[PDB]
Design a protein around this ligand. Structure first.
Ligand code: ADE
Ligand code: ADE
Lengths: 258, 258
């Protein structure tokens, strides 16, 4: 599986931009672009040899961790830190079988009893996304927490919080240019801040937006989608046009019509 | 007023393309582009010095005629052939006054008792658009008929038919890339053929399409517009997206929203 490397040590908006750009490039084949927006591979008929990409992250403390992303939805399915590998609870047999192909070389493979959706993760972390700061500093720390979990060094709530940080700075940033932009700003000014409503609503709406665009009438949505602005004010989306500069990738929902 | 020249003598799809391209360039200022489609100047506040463009047409018989197009809608308002000038009946005082600024140098200025809309013109011609052949040959002939009207040489029905030809090959071709394309084909293969339903429906719908696009919700139409394909089958338009490659210019209907 392809491996993309990134280090928080000395990261700049350019090193981070290049990274996210490399991830998107691995995620999509370029064979399916809907209204100028690339669509991720369809899970049906996809060979395991092309099902995952690995993201090796290192930090200033020289600790390294490798995350596995599923190509069909850009989800982090598990990670590896030295000796051991940890996987979120699979939500079906196809997926349970697919992950058996990852980190086959580790001596200790563990599968959590919980899945990786935000609801579960926030419960375990004891904090919501709106309260967890994002930025290069939080990421640097997340890499170490993830690493120390394999040594009994990290607490369950810290592990959960770390995943929340990693998932938004890697998977969500790859999905939305908007979110990647929010991250670039934090890195540029060395700011560490929790995500605003615009970010959280987009994260929550990815699956629906992907469906609405793919089932739209020449780009026109059958029913509008309510999003939130940074100030929290609601904002209705009626067309794929205003989303072209916001969403970078879509999950496959249906075949394109003639 | 700017003058654009075109000759049917030895015309090629390239000489015709350059011509239509020059007309569009005179018609629009470039200050108003709605969803990638240029909008014509608003009639309110437009100075007479920038209200018209002239199109001088010549043919193989060496006859010349000059048509006046109104910049706000690309309409042919009248023409000049040597000694005399003829104007369609103005449909308001603003317009009656504006045309007093055209062909001020002719010795004989006449204003028809009828206007230039297709309904009136088809009645006078004794034939509908669907029955009047378009092409370089029909245009070559139209220029002569228009010219001979000033000498008592052209019959009223032939004059009307000639205008119908001129209006579709100049004004409608400038408004729609689709119609300009239909004309290029006729010229390329030296074909002379009446317009199909796709052409006529577009001509009929220009004002509505301009309004629907300008009042759309992020490109999404509030109510769909029914057009016809070349084979006559109906086809619904729900978004401005599929029209971007079809319509070249829009008439000003409203100011653009923030
Ligand atoms: N583990 C995960 N990977 C990607 N997107 C997610 N959204 C919530 N959990 C996720
Ligand atoms: N005289 C004219 N000029 C432009 N478009 C027209 N449509 C009908 N009559 C017209």
């Amino acid at each position: 599986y392809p491996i993309i490397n990134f280090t928080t040590a000395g990261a700049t908006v350019q090193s981070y931009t290049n990274f996210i750009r490399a991830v998107r490039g691995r995620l999509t084949t370029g064979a399916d672009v809907r209204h100028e927006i690339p669509v991720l591979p369809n899970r049906v008929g996809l060979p395991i040899n092309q099902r995952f990409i690995l993201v090796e992250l290192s930090n200033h403390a020289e600790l390294s961790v490798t995350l596995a992303l599923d190509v069909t939805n850009a989800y982090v399915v598990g990670y590896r830190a030295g000796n051991s590998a940890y996987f979120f609870h699979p939500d079906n047999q196809e997926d349970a079988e697919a992950i058996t192909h990852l980190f086959t070389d580790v001596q200790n493979r563990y599968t959590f009893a919980f899945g990786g959706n935000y609801d579960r993760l926030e419960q375990l972390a004891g904090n919501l996304r709106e309260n967890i700061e994002l930025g290069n500093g939080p990421l640097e720390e997340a890499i170490s927490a993830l690493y120390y979990y394999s040594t009994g060094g990290t607490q369950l709530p810290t592990l959960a919080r770390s995943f929340i940080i990693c998932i938004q700075m890697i998977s969500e940033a790859a999905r939305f240019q908007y979110i990647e932009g929010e991250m670039r700003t934090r890195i540029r000014y060395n700011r560490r801040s929790a995500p605003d409503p615009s970010v959280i609503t987009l994260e929550n709406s990815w699956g629906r937006l992907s469906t609405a665009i793919q089932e739209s009438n020449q780009g026109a949505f059958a029913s509008p989608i309510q999003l939130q602005r940074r100030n929290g004010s609601k904002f209705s989306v009626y067309d794929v046009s205003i989303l072209i500069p916001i969403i970078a990738l879509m999950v496959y929902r249906c075949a394109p019509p003639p």
